[PDB]
Amino acid sequence: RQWALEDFEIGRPLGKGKFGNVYLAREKQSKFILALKVLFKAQLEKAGVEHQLRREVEIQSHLRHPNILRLYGYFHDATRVYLILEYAPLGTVYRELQKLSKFDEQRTATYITELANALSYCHSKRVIHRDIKPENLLLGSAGELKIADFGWSVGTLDYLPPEMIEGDEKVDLWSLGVLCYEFLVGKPPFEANTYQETYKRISRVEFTFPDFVTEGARDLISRLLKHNPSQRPMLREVLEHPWITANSS
């Protein structure tokens, strides 16, 4: 099932930078709408990332869940790698957060639920996921989030757990705690001005809450941001948390 750049029509650029941009696209024969992610080869071999792509791709091609961005295929040419992706038309949770400043209790619980499901589903298939940033969280036609990064296996400090910065399975839970906080306060709990300092804050687990944060949210966030992995809830217990069930559509 060889795809080629001539089976598509490329349209408006959707987002940019680094390895290469993402263009909106439609397959000529069927008229299917989707996303083309373009990546210059040479420029990725020279960052030594070449190989991890093939694996995250292999991993993704067999992944199917309504809160995980679909990967339909890929192909290469002389110079370039192209990924054929599901298209999510409401943009990123990141840009939504910039627009609204901060989400409300209802939207947060909803997203955390949709993510928790997508991560339960992942674990069953012995797939485990690294850090999760809002940059990599897209929204579908019905406003539902989709995990859109290529970071699996069988986050410029902010989203990384203490395990990955000092010396699995529980990394996910830490991720939900960071995202859950950021949703309600509008910036991640360990944001600092330098790498050096963010590293100290995460390593020691230094955060405080603004005064608008209801006790229920404090209680969930504090359970998930524990230095020791084994003290973190299982995904299940997060799905059934008093504050979650009360607020999650």
Ligand SMILES: Cc1cc(Nc2nn(-c3ccccc3)c(=O)c3ccccc23)n[nH]1
């Ligand atoms: C992979 C994918 C993207 C997408 N839709 C979009 N992606 N990205 C984006 C942001 C940063 C970097 C790359 C793309 C967008 O800003 C965006 C904005 C409005 C509507 C849709 C999208 N659907 N599927």
